[PDB]
Design a protein around this nucleic acid. Structure first.
Ligand SMILES: [Zn+2]
Lengths: 100, 107, 93, 84, 79, 99, 81, 93
DNA sequence: ATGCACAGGATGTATATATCTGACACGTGCCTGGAGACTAGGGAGTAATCCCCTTGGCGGTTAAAACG
DNA sequence: GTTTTAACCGCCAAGGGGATTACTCCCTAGTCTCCAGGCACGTGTCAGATATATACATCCTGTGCAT
């Protein structure tokens, strides 16, 4: 008769949304992002040294842009009477934004 | 006689002399009007006071004695004119306004 | 060397509006960045206006027009009032 | 002669005071059996009118239409072929 | 070398949550990886351009600030 | 003895083809000028206008409207629809940044 | 000068949408289009009049419209440059 | 009075690439406006570059950097090649 | 047996309180950048001219708008 | 498909202001001299971080009432 407790689908999601719409700290791991940045900074020049402040500013800007894109994608998916986002929503959002 | 700051003459807190020097060295025009730096410093001081007031209100609402970038972001995004002014401005560690769409709420 | 900023003036303005509220370093760094951004925007627009009318001098009228063009509604009106009052006070003094 | 107090609509007060979604039917059947002795046909209407706000009388859109030369004015007034 | 896979799905989920996203498809993650990569190229190219014109070998934060500013994405808090 | 009417939509496609090849203005000039002067009345009275200015406003407005219509069409199609809804326009303008 | 925004007739908006690639159009669109167009026109004309007044002029030139459009991030070619 | 434009040089280039092709006045003005806009973009970017580096001169290096920043890919590369070639030719002659 | 309405255990969140720290605020020397004084000459303000360009109107056609 | 209107064209006319030109003048760039406002630097607290130990507030499933 022993049952394990578990919330219904969509509860932990709302809890996380509330949690992360309140905090402001960065969400991406520092080292993987730094390694990705350095790898990208090789097809323009080799042996590129980096101030830490540049890396953190890049992370801030990238995360802000990604969050804004996520919110636009959410609006696009909601407009399609859905709660799940699929990449066509991202494509439409970037197309309307003029990125495409 | 004794030197008197032009800001005091205009009754401002922003350094009018520094503003005038920067205007001269900013390659904006050959000549700079005498009443220009005063006007610019006054406008800057007014905007600074406005946003500082809003940020202090936000910090008090968080029961904190010091304004943090989160307070600045909240004040800017909450003020319609200020948000429109800084439409394309990204604030570091500012976070976002807590907002959840209605349809995602449990029903 | 020494680098100048707006820290002291922003601090004084804060003490005028909130005589008890402190501030962190990141906040006043953002403050200085915002001040510089507004300064450059207004100065560039004023220079554009002056070149538009074939004039070699930047006066307070140019800044008034630039502020009217850059700030929305009530902010623009209030800033115009502040600039006019400060100019009149300085000229009278 | 202002009431000087919390004023609510007839529908508003009905929905704010007697709002028993489970036991509304109980009150309906209570009124129905109360009126069953004399007037059972009109019991439901006698109950329901207390759930509605005051209104201005209007013809029910088919007394008007049997006469083609009759039209309703702006504020519900009567208008005919002599209106200009 | 697949640092694009350094962007794990928990981080993408966290960013979506801060973005107010509730339900996420499985195909989303790679799309975000690609879009983020494109953004990174666009910024970093200009950043390196600025670093080179200054005849420097170390990229400064001010270079990134200028690159973001000229792309219409103003950033504060760094100079 | 039949009216010989075209099906709903083929005429729309034909006029889409017609108007995607032309370049002339699609709005009557006089009403546009009247509206422009009416709007300008609220900023300063007794304002005169160069004709090239009114043409400039008409061209810019029509181009902006065409762009907005194109975005709205994509938004509505994303909803798997064929008819344009005002909610599509509102979403498009919000995404652009105008809202 | 009153009630001119009705001057943009429904066929005009229809043609605009057809050039925009729209095939089927709802009837409750036209007033929304008129409102958005009014907002855009107001935003442009405000800055155009500001430019005209700063020059102490009484007629609005196309070149003022060019500057106003440029400042709003909508550059237009072919009207003086 | 007299107003100047890029009309004659545009017509020269048109005859260079398409010797048998005419041009309307409105299109001609369109190219004039386009050239003006590109001029402003490059000049402003070069000025910002000079100010950032604390320099008093606008040299060809700054022009090349601005061209790289403002032009997409192959356009930037070909324009850089053309500018370098023209500079070399002028310096030699 | 079905839609509603409580009871309650689980659970994650918010409060209360105690401690420690480094981050902010404050005090000090100095020096260089702003202030005060003086000049000249040119950019800007002012006055007179004109004529072009803006506005305004009136009549006729009809394409386009309106309507069902 | 049928009916209505006002956009548009042409043609004309009057005048307002924007462009032009000449003259003047005062305002700002330029120069020198002087001094204190702001900045780099050093100390000292206390706002907030951090840790722990309790009230809440929901989530959610298991009860009944009865239709
Ligand atoms: Zn009521």
């Amino acid at each position: 008769v022993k049952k394990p407790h578990r919330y219904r689908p969509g509860t932990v999601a709302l809890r996380e949304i509330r949690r992360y719409q309140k905090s402001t700290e960065l969400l991406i791991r520092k080292l993987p992002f730094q390694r990705l940045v350095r790898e990208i900074a090789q097809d323009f020049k080799t042996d590129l040294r980096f101030q830490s402040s540049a890396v953190m500013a890049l992370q801030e800007a990238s995360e802000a842009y990604l969050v804004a894109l996520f919110e636009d994608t959410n609006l696009c998916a909601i407009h399609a009477k859905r709660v799940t986002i699929m990449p066509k929503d991202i494509q439409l959002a970037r197309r309307i934004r003029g990125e495409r | 006689a004794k030197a008197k700051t032009r800001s005091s003459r205009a009754g401002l807190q922003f350094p009018v002399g520094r503003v005038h020097r920067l205007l001269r060295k900013g390659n904006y025009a050959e000549r700079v009007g005498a009443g220009a730096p005063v006007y610019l410093a006054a406008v800057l001081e007014y905007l600074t006071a406005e946003i500082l007031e809003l940020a202090g209100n936000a910090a008090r609402d968080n029961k904190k004695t010091r304004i943090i970038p989160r307070h600045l972001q909240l004040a800017v995004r909450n003020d319609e004119e200020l948000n429109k002014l800084l439409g394309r401005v990204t604030i570091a560690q500012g976070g976002v306004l807590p907002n959840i769409q209605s349809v995602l709420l449990p029903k | 060397t020494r680098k100048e900023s707006y820290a002291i003036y922003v601090y004084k303005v804060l003490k005028q509006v909130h005589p008890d509220t402190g501030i962190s370093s990141k906040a006043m760094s953002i403050m200085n960045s915002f001040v510089n951004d507004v300064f450059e925007r207004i100065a560039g627009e004023a220079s554009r206006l002056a070149h538009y009318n074939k004039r070699s001098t930047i006066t307070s009228r140019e800044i008034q027009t630039a502020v009217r063009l850059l700030l929305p509604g009530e902010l623009a009106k209030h800033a115009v009032s502040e600039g006019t009052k400060a100019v009149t006070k300085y000229t009278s003094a | 002669n202002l009431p000087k107090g919390d004023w609510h609509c007839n529908e508003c007060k009905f929905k704010i005071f007697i709002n028993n979604s489970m036991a509304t039917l109980k009150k309906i059947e209570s009124n129905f059996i109360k009126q069953n002795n004399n007037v059972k046909i009109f019991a439901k209407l006698l109950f329901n009118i207390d759930s509605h706000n005051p209104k201005q009388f209007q013809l029910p859109n088919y007394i008007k239409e049997t006469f083609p030369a009759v039209k309703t004015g702006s504020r519900g007034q009567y208008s005919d072929e002599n209106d200009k | 070398r697949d640092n694009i896979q350094g962007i794990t799905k928990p981080a993408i989920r966290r960013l979506a949550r801060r973005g107010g996203v509730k339900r996420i498809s499985g195909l989303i993650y790679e799309e975000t990886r690609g879009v983020l990569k494109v953004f990174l190229e666009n910024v970093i190219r200009d950043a390196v351009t600025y670093t080179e014109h200054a005849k420097r070998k170390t990229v400064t934060a001010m270079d990134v600030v200028y690159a973001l500013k000229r792309q219409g994405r103003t950033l504060y808090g760094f100079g």
